[PDB]
């Protein structure tokens, strides 16, 4: 699995900024948003990996991601 950071396509970032009320979206901010998303995922998924490793499991459940987001002050409801 390589070059999946391009999977977050340009209209996806367009829609994400439109949800946030952005008027104009630059051409250079897509790479920056991809990097920010990569950093956030490399934190949260790594925390969930540690949770799954401690949980004696090889499959990352939604609950482990839930407290992985909770421990960083970003608690998510509904899972």
């Amino acid at each position: 699995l390589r070059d999946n950071i391009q999977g977050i396509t340009k209209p996806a970032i367009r829609r994400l900024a439109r949800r946030g009320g952005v008027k104009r979206i630059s051409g250079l901010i897509y790479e920056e948003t991809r990097g920010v998303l990569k950093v956030f995922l490399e934190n949260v998924i790594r925390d969930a990996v540690t949770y799954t490793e401690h949980a004696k499991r090889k499959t990352v459940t939604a609950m482990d991601v839930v407290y992985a987001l909770k421990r960083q002050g970003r608690t998510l409801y509904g899972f």
């Binding site: 909770k70 409801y77 899972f79």
Partner: protein, 91 residues
């Protein structure tokens, strides 16, 4: 197995406050996670409050202090009044 859930109590509270509205599975799951997270926050605040003054017990004053520490504004006072009313009706 049996899994603990808060669906029916939230449902009857909803029927008490608004009997003309329903709820969905996703909305129930959001409400369950919200009430559970508030439970852990208030219970942990009460546990820390007991641990600060070498208190071996958690009383209603622990929950009231946790509510005033967590809930801002008039929400904390309303929750404190509701808890006081429930405590007086309990005895």
């Amino acid at each position: 197995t049996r899994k603990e859930s808060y669906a029916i109590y939230v449902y009857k509270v909803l029927k008490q406050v608004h009997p003309d509205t329903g709820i969905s599975s996703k909305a129930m799951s959001i409400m369950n996670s919200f009430v559970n997270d508030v439970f852990e926050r208030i219970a942990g605040e009460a546990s820390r409050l007991a641990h600060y003054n070498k208190r071996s017990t958690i009383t209603s004053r622990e929950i009231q202090t946790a509510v005033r520490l967590l809930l801002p504004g008039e929400l904390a006072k309303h929750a404190v009044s509701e808890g006081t009313k429930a405590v007086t009706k309990y005895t």
